[PDB]
Design a protein around this ligand. Structure first.
Ligand SMILES: NS(=O)(=O)c1ccc(C(=O)N2CCC(c3ccccc3)CC2)cc1
Ligand SMILES: [Zn+2]
Length: 259
């Protein structure tokens, strides 16, 4: 139905999902000087278990790692959140070159990639799907990826990509701790937004970390080697699977720190 190609890309989604023109769409360009320092905010805590990961999957849009969310062991809490949100999955958005790839931008600057850790409000909703439609249903922590030095923990993931290079394939991915992909800082920006893929529901509290993690150009290349296509179809590389910044429309971006 939708994608990131020339015929089905982001610029066209509004024709299928009208909410794409809504008042709290994501991602956004974060103007650091315009963020409101918010001391009252609570400390952001990412309490992740080491072995809650289930599999790694190429779903045609990204490569996604799914988690066991039957309990509240792997959750995000604090910051703008009133309670814990359980981690359901994490995935990435990236470009064909270093200058593009992230969904959020900071003062007009894009990163080559962006990691999204998707959590849901299991205290208020019965299913991830149900939570994905409600205004306070999801909390996504965004982590920017810069290219430079090799990321040791990332290797276990980038080495697994070959096995899921084609759309619709999956592999077991046990004991991968998502905490290994977080920067040494927990400072962040936060604002009320939406899913960045259809249905584009405005159900997401965004928490974009200030500090990016770094991976090697070689590792970033393993992502650019994935395919949007099936094993039979003509090979079309999975790149530029990101949605561009959307209108802020008077929303206030809060910061946990001072720029
Ligand atoms: N990029 S992101 O905003 O972090 C993000 C967050 C969540 C998802 C996600 O889990 N999927 C699968 C379920 C689908 C869906 C939800 C509700 C109703 C119908 C279909 C939405 C996309 C994708 C990207
Ligand atoms: Zn995403």
């Amino acid at each position: 139905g939708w994608g990131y190609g020339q015929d089905d890309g982001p610029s066209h989604w509004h024709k299928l999902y009208p909410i794409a023109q809504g008042d709290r769409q994501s991602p956004i360009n974060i103007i650091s000087s315009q963020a409101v320092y918010s001391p009252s905010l609570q400390p952001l805590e990412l309490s992740y278990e080491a072995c809650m990961s289930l599999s790694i999957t190429n779903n045609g849009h990204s490569v996604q790692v799914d988690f066991n969310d039957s309990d509240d062991r792997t959750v995000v809490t604090g910051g703008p959140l009133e309670g814990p949100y359980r981690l359901k999955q994490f995935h990435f958005h990236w470009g064909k070159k270093h200058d593009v790839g992230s969904e959020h931008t900071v003062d007009g600057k894009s990163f080559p990639s962006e990691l999204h850790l998707v959590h849901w409000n299991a205290k208020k909703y019965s299913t991830f799907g149900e939570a994905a439609s409600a205004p306070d249903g999801l909390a996504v922590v965004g982590v920017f990826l810069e290219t430079g030095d090799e990321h040791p923990s990332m290797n276990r993931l980038t080495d697994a990509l070959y096995m899921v290079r084609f759309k619709g394939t999956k592999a077991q991915f046990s004991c991968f701790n998502p905490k290994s992909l977080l920067p040494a800082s927990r400072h962040y920006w936060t604002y009320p937004g939406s899913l960045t893929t259809p249905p584009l529901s405005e159900s997401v509290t965004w928490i974009v970390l200030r500090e990016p993690i770094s991976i090697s150009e070689r590792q970033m290349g393993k992502f650019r080697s994935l395919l949007f296509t099936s094993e039979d179809d003509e090979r079309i590389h999975m790149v530029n699977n990101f949605r561009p910044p959307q209108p802020l429309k008077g929303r206030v971006v809060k910061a946990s720190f001072r720029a």
